[PDB]
Symmetry: C3
Subunit: 90 residues, 3 copies
């Protein structure tokens, strides 16, 4: 019923991404230094966590979206979100 | 009823901050290398996430506190907690 | 009933650790660049958060596991998980 969030950031400006799980849907809000805006991430789930890392200037983000006991990893590597190889046996 | 936590850290010592949402209140415990102590952060919410980054030696922390479907961003930039510009339309 | 996750990463490969709280047990899945595998972390709790930092090449991880209103810190410093000094008065 109530929302759950996860957050990551990179750089010095910085860039910030905030993921919100709300009523079974996870969405993304973005800051790149001047105004919040809506990101491309849209995936189902009731729970979210996130981590990210830089390779030089290139950001890589991994979002772990869970529904029930099933966790799906979503990957940003500069050119769209794709499903990752993560599995777990919950 | 049960608590929910979020954590961030910076440096090599390191500094650690742990935020706990408990019965609608979010509080902060701190480690700077020698003993845990209570931090200045006190804001309402049932859910918390956090991210942080360094600009040189200066730490910046962003805490995302949610109550119901409403998320408020709180900002530490070295001189007190202030409300951030984050909005979302949950 | 539904799982809750936390995630951290380090380096450029990168290394990723995903912690899952499920039915009162927290477990760990690991990525070091080529295949997911099960980590050594096994501790009780209904809620998990995590942070990590590098000292040179040496990773240090702190997992905050909560049951009810009681939070226990677990420490990885390269040679096994040990209970940390964290306390809180929830
Ligand atoms: O600039 C916004 C954006 O491209 O940033 C990287 C990822 O967070 C994307 O989902 C997002 O749309
Ligand atoms: O390039 C995608 C990928 O290999 O990135 C590292 C890990 O997140 C993997 O699960 C994932 O499939
Ligand atoms: O040294 C403790 C402290 O000043 O560290 C920075 C922020 O975490 C503050 O809320 C906190 O009181
Ligand atoms: O200086 C505060 C601020 O600009 O920092 C970056 C973002 O966290 C913004 O939402 C926030 O208002
Ligand atoms: O390579 C896996 C491993 O050793 O990595 C460091 C920690 O995450 C441990 O719990 C884990 O078993
Ligand atoms: O070496 C372990 C330890 O000192 O590391 C820093 C903090 O996580 C402390 O709570 C913890 O006991």
């Amino acid at each position: 019923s109530s929302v759950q969030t996860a957050a990551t950031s990179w750089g010095t400006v910085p860039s910030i991404r905030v993921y919100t799980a709300n009523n079974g849907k996870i969405t993304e809000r973005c800051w790149d230094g001047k105004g919040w805006y809506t990101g491309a991430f849209n995936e189902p789930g009731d729970n979210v966590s996130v981590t990210s890392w830089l390779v030089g200037s290139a950001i890589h983000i991994r979002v772990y979206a869970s529904t029930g006991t099933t966790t799906t990893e979503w990957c940003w590597d500069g050119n769209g979100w794709t499903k990752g190889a993560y599995t777990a046996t919950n």
